[PDB]
């Protein structure tokens, strides 16, 4: 790609056979996917921004596919209104912003 | 500019003889500034984040120079973690997500 900002940057990801939609967030520190039953160990954590903080569970080394590009990283599950692909993984598929 | 994601995409914004550090957040619909006085009649708005909704005070048509590229538009002032340049001003200046 080269995604356009006219419309939000929604894309599609693979997570454990979950084909899903995500917002490429150059403004997200982390990756927060809504409610999903990942396999494993986690540790609560807190994140916030406009609004305040909300609690999410953090999973280590989880494999993911951002539009035919593998990447594996930390992924937070929790009460988000949009699965969001933060920079952590963003940095693994070669995303840049250009103007 | 080709800006990588290994660090937050923070660039200097020139907003009417005022300079600030803002964040190129492609997950943001709008441009939200930390409390500030702008010339103009505002109207109160409520926008949302991961934490919930915040009441903001909005200014229409306002020029901003995003690292020496000019945008002219809505700019909301409020209680944010930081300055975010959203897809409102972000597409005026022609930013794209490449990967």
């Amino acid at each position: 790609p080269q995604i356009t900002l006219w419309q939000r940057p929604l894309v599609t990801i693979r997570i454990g056979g979950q084909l899903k939609e995500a917002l490429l967030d150059t403004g997200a520190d982390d990756t927060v996917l809504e409610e999903m039953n990942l396999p494993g160990k986690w540790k609560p954590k807190m994140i916030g921004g406009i609004g305040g903080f909300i609690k999410v569970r953090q999973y280590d080394q989880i494999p993911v596919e951002i539009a035919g590009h593998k990447a594996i990283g930390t992924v937070l599950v929790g009460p988000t209104p949009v699965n969001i692909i933060g920079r952590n993984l963003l940095t693994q598929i070669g995303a840049t912003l250009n103007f | 500019p080709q800006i990588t994601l290994w660090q937050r995409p923070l660039v200097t914004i020139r907003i009417g003889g005022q300079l600030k550090e803002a964040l190129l957040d492609t997950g943001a619909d709008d441009t939200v500034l930390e409390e500030m006085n702008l010339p103009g009649k505002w109207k109160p708005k409520m926008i949302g984040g991961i934490g919930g909704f915040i009441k903001v005070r909005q200014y229409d048509q306002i020029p901003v120079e995003i690292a020496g590229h000019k945008a002219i538009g809505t700019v909301l002032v409020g209680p944010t973690p930081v300055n975010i340049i959203g897809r409102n001003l972000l597409t005026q200046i022609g930013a794209t997500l490449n990967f």
Partner: peptide, 7 residues
Amino acid sequence: VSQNXIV
């Protein structure tokens, strides 16, 4: 009805 994204 406008949303804005994480620290």
